Each structure stands twice: as C-alpha cells, then as structure tokens.
Design a protein around this ligand. Structure first.
Ligand SMILES: COC(=O)c1c(O)cc(O)c(Cl)c1CCc1nccn1Cc1ccccc1
Ligand SMILES: [Mg+2]
Ligand code: NA
Length: 208
C-alpha cells in the first residue's frame, strides 16, 4: 500500500523554483545532503552515549557515494539515525514550511540559492540535479520506509520491500539527463574536496 500526500504550498513553490532554475552552481546539492547525513550520524552517536544498544543495528558510522551510469542514479548512503514513518511525515511539516517560505523571501531580497541550508531546507537542492528523489530510511524504532517525489506537488510513502538497510538513510538521486556529470568520478571527487572533506565521518566514493 502506497500513501500519496500533497506538499505544503510553500514547499511545492520552492521545489518548482529549484527544479526550473538555471542557477549554475548546482554542485552545492552534494554538500547539503552530506551535511544532512553528518547531522544524522551525529544524532545516533550522541544518543548511543547513554544507550549503547542503539548501535546494535550497525556500529559503523559512515557515508557512501554510489554512482550508477546504467540507472543514471547517484546514491548517498549514511548509517545515521534514520527516520520513522512519523519523522518522514513530520519533517515535511511546519518547520519545513517556515524554512522554505523564508528562504524564498531571502532570494527575493538578493540571496543566493547556495544559502538554502541556512534555513534548514537544503534537502530540496537535490532537485537542482535530480528529476526524482527516493529516500529509503530505517530508524531503530520503526520499519523501513521509502519516500519519493518528482516535484509535481506530491510525494509518496510506502513500506520498503527492498534490501534491509540496518539503520540510516539512503538518498537516490535520479539525475536529470543533462546533469550526468555527477556520475563522473573526477567531478564527485572535486566537489567533495571543495565542500565536504572535513566532515567528521568517512566518505567513500564507490567505483562503477
Ligand atoms: C534524519 O535525517 C535523515 O535521516 C536524513 C539523512 O540521513 C540524509 C539526508 O540527505 C536527509 Cl535529507 C535526511 C533527512 C533530513 C530531514 N530532516 C528533516 C527534513 N529532512 C528532509 C527530508 C527529506 C525527505 C523526506 C523526509 C525528510
Ligand atoms: Mg512543485
Ligand atoms: Na548540464
């Protein structure tokens, strides 16, 4: 069974701006998603300080970058805290409504799309390079779920039948056909080095 939800108006408006902008510095999407992974890895780490059993689902805290030119996908995998179904629906709620609303006001006032993460809505920079985004996630307190959207004003949530993840979040970027550079080793290596290498977790770029 699949549930389909409408985005908040402000989030749909931001998604339409991002997916259609000709903003040239699109590479910032990767910094924003790796930042989200780092924050999620922190969360499970701080939690495990008191409750070490919280790492029973996976002791390794890392980020993997998996390009696939056959599928035209860039996947970012982390073993952070993951999200419950409730988290998946709540995270698209009122904190995200006010952040998107305010980022759009900043852009009108001369701000740069690169500031998106400052309002806590950096995830949506994915749509600079992706026509569809699938988020697979597994939290200790819930089962594995798949969130997905092609920025048409709606997203879906379903229980995920795919391979068990253990714990964490997998973001699958279905790239626009003219954003295939983000499958190239040389390009990903540049972007990580320029914007993300001082993240406090291992970042592994897989070969294809
Ligand atoms: C806990 O954070 C994670 O599991 C996680 C992660 O590990 C790596 C990532 O790239 C992202 Cl986007 C998230 C989720 C970060 C988030 N918090 C609040 C809102 N959203 C965006 C959202 C995007 C899509 C679905 C639900 C939420
Ligand atoms: Mg939209
Ligand atoms: Na291009």
């Amino acid at each position: 069974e699949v549930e389909t939800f409408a985005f908040q108006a402000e989030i749909a408006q931001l998604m339409s701006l991002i997916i259609n902008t000709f903003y040239s510095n699109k590479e910032i999407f990767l910094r924003e998603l790796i930042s989200n992974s780092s924050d999620a890895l922190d969360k499970i780490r701080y939690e495990s300080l008191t409750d070490p059993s919280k790492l029973d689902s996976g002791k390794e805290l890392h980020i993997n970058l998996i390009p696939n030119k056959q599928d035209r996908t860039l996947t970012i995998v982390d073993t952070g805290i993951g999200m419950t179904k409730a988290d998946l629906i709540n995270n698209l709620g009122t904190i995200a409504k006010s952040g998107t609303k305010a980022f759009m006001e900043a852009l009108q006032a001369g701000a740069d799309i690169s500031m998106i993460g400052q309002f806590g809505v950096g995830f949506y920079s994915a749509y600079l390079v992706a026509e569809k985004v699938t988020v697979i996630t597994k939290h200790n307190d819930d089962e594995q779920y798949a969130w997905e959207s092609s920025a048409g004003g709606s997203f879906t949530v379903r229980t995920d039948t795919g391979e068990p993840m253990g714990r964490g979040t997998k973001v699958i970027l279905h790239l626009k056909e003219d954003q295939t550079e983000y499958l190239e080793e040389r390009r990903i290596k540049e972007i990580v080095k320029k914007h993300s290498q001082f993240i406090g977790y291992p970042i592994t770029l897989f070969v294809e």
